[PDB]
Amino acid sequence: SRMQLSEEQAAVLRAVLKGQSIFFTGSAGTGKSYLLKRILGSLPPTGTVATASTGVAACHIGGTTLHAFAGIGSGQAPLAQCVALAQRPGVRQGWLNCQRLVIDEISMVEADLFDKLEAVARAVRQQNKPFGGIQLIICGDFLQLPPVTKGSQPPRFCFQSKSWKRCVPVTLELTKVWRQADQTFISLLQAVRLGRCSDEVTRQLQATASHKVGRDGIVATRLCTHQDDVALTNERRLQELPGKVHRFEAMDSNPELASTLDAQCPVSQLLQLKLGAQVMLVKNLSVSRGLVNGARGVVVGFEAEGRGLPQVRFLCGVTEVIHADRWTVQATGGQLLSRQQLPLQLAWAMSIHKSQGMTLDCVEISLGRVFASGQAYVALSRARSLQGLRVLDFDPMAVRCDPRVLHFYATLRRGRSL
Numbered sequence: 001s002r003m004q005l006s007e008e009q010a011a012v013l014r015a016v017l018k019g020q021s022i023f024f025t026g027s028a029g030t031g032k033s034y035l036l037k038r039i040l041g042s043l044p045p046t047g048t049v050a051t052a053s054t055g056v057a058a059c060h061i062g063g064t065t066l067h068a069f070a071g072i073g074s075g076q077a078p079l080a081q082c083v084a085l086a087q088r089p090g091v092r093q094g095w096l097n098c099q100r101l102v103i104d105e106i107s108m109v110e111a112d113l114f115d116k117l118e119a120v121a122r123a124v125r126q127q128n129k130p131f132g133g134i135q136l137i138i139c140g141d142f143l144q145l146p147p148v149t150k151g152s153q154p155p156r157f158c159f160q161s162k163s164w165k166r167c168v169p170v171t172l173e174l175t176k177v178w179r180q181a182d183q184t185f186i187s188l189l190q191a192v193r194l195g196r197c198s199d200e201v202t203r204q205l206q207a208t209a210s211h212k213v214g215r216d217g218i219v220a221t222r223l224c225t226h227q228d229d230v231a232l233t234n235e236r237r238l239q240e241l242p243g244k245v246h247r248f249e250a251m252d253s254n255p256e257l258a259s260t261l262d263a264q265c266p267v268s269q270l271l272q273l274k275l276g277a278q279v280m281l282v283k284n285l286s287v288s289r290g291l292v293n294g295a296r297g298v299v300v301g302f303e304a305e306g307r308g309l310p311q312v313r314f315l316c317g318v319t320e321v322i323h324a325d326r327w328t329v330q331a332t333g334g335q336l337l338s339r340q341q342l343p344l345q346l347a348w349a350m351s352i353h354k355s356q357g358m359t360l361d362c363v364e365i366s367l368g369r370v371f372a373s374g375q376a377y378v379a380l381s382r383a384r385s386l387q388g389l390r391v392l393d394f395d396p397m398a399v400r401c402d403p404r405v406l407h408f409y410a411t412l413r414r415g416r417s418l
């Protein structure tokens, strides 16, 4: 059986099944992505397209990227050239057959791109209504990760698009945090999300610097702003371990398209492991045994037989041999690509962008620098519990909310009861 939707969650589902285009929003861990899964399960699969702004986020809901669905290249070309690309075989059919378009993590989509997609929808489907008449089902949190751009200009938030409100006329909120169980931590995260670091908030985050978050042989994943820093840390730490290297080579359906696969898949072509390697499980294997996406462990052995698969001891307690898994990604024009590989990544470090949408339970972050709006909040709001979090050098300068977003939220709630 499945969990009981809150009243707020049920209201969103009601709107969607009435055919209403909607944006629904809420703090980290309010069940937005979970509700998207329930929505997709309640709709006919024909005519329903599941996307997210990013590859990492698309994985959480079993969807494709909005880039891959649109098939307009980067979206930087002139509109007429974007339309021509959208008319290509397979791409075109995707636009024509789409009756309902789901988009998670809307906060990373910039307004100029939204405008472009809206216009492409109209041109390709030859329907002179907002977004070509597609029912839009959009969610995310504009106080989380900010918009990116394939161009060179400062991006606008998606809600700045002159078509935003016309395309998503209804807005609902999820207000009950589920990810964290502890009210103290929930209240602390809410203050951070709104950029309200009181002396008490700042004191509580600084106190985490003393947290021992690692257990026997497992150490915290450091969350970093940039993948360069992640790659160098994981490689240096692996190198310093004394054991022999064990290698696991992925099998791809189209090796020549590996880079397309890489954008939408959490595992690498070449996985290298040693005794003592710090690893993250990047696929749900068994919710019951705590073997879920984000679970942290350490390699404690390799099997003597066959491929010599790794034995991994996880923080929760279970020790388990990790077998091959498989990811099938939906690329442009409905093309499918697959990768077979062990569902493990090295995890002495991880980028904040790769943690988007995830729950983690053994994390360290240094928060003494200016960050992107919403980025400090995303990093802190991944942790299930205050005790799996160690913040170093915390300073409220790290915590920034874009004034455009505070103004958006205030306008949104203007007529509401609370």
Ligand SMILES: Nc1ncnc2c1ncn2[C@@H]1O[C@H](COP(=O)(O)OP(=O)(O)NP(=O)(O)O)[C@@H](O)[C@H]1O
Pocket (backbone or CB within 6 Å): 003, 004, 005, 006, 009, 026, 027, 028, 029, 030, 031, 032, 033, 034, 035, 141, 178, 179, 356, 357, 358
């Ligand atoms: N009705 C519910 N009752 C209990 N737990 C729930 C409910 N809805 C969602 N959850 C749990 O809440 C946790 C967070 O859900 P998730 O869908 O990741 O939230 P989110 O709002 O998408 N998070 P984020 O992407 O970080 O903003 C998951 O462990 C869900 O199982």
Ligand SMILES: CC(=O)Nc1ccc(-c2csc(N)n2)cc1
Pocket (backbone or CB within 6 Å): 055, 056, 059, 230, 234, 262, 263, 264, 265, 266, 267, 280, 282, 345, 346, 347, 349, 350, 351, 354, 355
């Ligand atoms: C689509 C995609 O690229 N996903 C993804 C998710 C998580 C990670 C990860 C976990 S620990 C680490 N160093 N990296 C890598 C990749």
Ligand SMILES: [Mg+2]
Pocket (backbone or CB within 6 Å): 032, 033, 034, 357
């Ligand atoms: Mg989510």
Ligand code: NA
Pocket (backbone or CB within 6 Å): 261, 262, 263, 264, 265, 266, 267
């Ligand atoms: Na990847």
